Amino acid sequence: NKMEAKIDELINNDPVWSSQNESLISKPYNHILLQINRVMNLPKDQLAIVSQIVELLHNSSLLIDDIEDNAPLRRGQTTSHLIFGVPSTINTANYMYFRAMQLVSQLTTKEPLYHNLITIFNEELINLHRGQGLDIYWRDFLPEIIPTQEMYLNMVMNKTGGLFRLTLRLMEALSPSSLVPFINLLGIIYQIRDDYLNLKDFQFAEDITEGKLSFPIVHALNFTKTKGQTEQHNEILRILLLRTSDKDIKLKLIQILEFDTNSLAYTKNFINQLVNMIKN
Amino acid sequence: NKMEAKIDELINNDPVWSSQNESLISKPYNHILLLIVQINRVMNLPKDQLAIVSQIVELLHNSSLLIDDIEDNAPLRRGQTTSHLIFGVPSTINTANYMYFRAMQLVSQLTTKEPLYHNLITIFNEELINLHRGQGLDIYWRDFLPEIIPTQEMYLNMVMNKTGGLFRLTLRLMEALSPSLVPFINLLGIIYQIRDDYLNLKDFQFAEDITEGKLSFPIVHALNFTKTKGQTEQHNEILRILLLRTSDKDIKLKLIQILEFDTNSLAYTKNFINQLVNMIKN
Ligand SMILES: CCCCCCC(O)(P(=O)(O)O)P(=O)(O)O
């Protein structure tokens, strides 16, 4: 009857999707929205698409990161998952990873080069997830595994390194005219400095509430272990396992790192040495 | 300088990742581990290629299920506790997304010919975009109810994107490799989804679709039917029960008997399914 006819039109056409449907799906993403080329020389408009790709990937990974860390704030406003819900926020971020994958074919149609660009995109997203996976495992299975400094730096080369290397590698492949080593050291300085300032700025220090194995915390645990300081080693673990928002307890942990282990000075010195490798 | 030398070797090499590290982040996926052949008797693909299409579709389907269960707050899958309740929502979201990109990587094992490779990756990308558009609408309607009450036509379009996505992904990759069945695979997909919604209630008559608050095919028919017939009290009671997110067995049976005797949504759904099967069989 009339029904068969409707079904018939439906199954012989592409799936139906409107601009109004698209706006519903983008609500969690729009909420978060609120120089190297001097060397590579890419045509200003090819340069725009790379910029759109990087922005899509960065903002989407942040939406997922805030759910994985149970975070209340980002860029000074309530997090998207607390407004639209965890379900809609996961699906929207994941949708945008595939929208970014689609902009790659707009960079070129040369079949050989296209394949290399997709391989770069695939490899670095695999590295970002392997690094984020290990950082989460250490935090959520604590005190099963306490990483060493060497293990921490390998995690950062995967995690933080992934999107820095992604941006740089796409640009070098497209250049009409390798700084990877330089971009790798830049990502390492950036991550250790972030961990350092999260504590020094407080002195909200949310890395303590989250129980993160940050660069300063890694130094402190291995220092107390090496010197046989049993009670202090254990006190650091107890406070991290509390998942606390209590300002007085966070200050107590910060005091151990400053007065017992000298971990803040140690980290300051480490960052300085890394910066010097470039300045000399 | 012992440092500077170490730092220099680190930045001049690829990132370090061990087999022990691979095993730790695979825990959520290994836990869930515990149509193609048919179709092939038309496409005639070689067995080596057929096996690769199969690993790809399995990777994508199982990873999708890990995320769907978080999105639905589901306590059980395949008779066992869900991965997010065992390993935590954080590791489970990360591991599922990691596997989406490992599946992408497998596509390059299907051929060494550049033009064919570009078509396979395009098909992959198109159907994952469609899967996410349909799941996005299904989640929005349920989480923001009663802001939007979908009609039968809006539901069917949501299913063509969602359930149609994986059925078309399998068939389209096979057709691209053969040395169209799409309309047929679209209808099989619609039949599959409406039958799943129907049986979840009929079997109870644990009807977890009710606990979840889902705008299922029978619930969509009931809300529009009560609106059309002016049954204001019954329309509002259906909404109230879905918004409770209840596990009470008497409350779930009360709603199913409203669809059986008051709106006749269960009989409507059974006949709708029969008519779609006839369009095929006949
Ligand atoms: C999976 C993307 C991770 C992006 C960074 C997340 C952080 O948790 P971290 O880099 O300090 O570990 P944030 O930059 O939000 O503090």
Ligand SMILES: CCCCCCC(O)(P(=O)(O)O)P(=O)(O)O
């Ligand atoms: C993005 C999720 C794809 C798989 C969904 C399967 C179901 O979510 P559906 O019945 O809602 O289509 P399930 O019956 O496993 O909950």
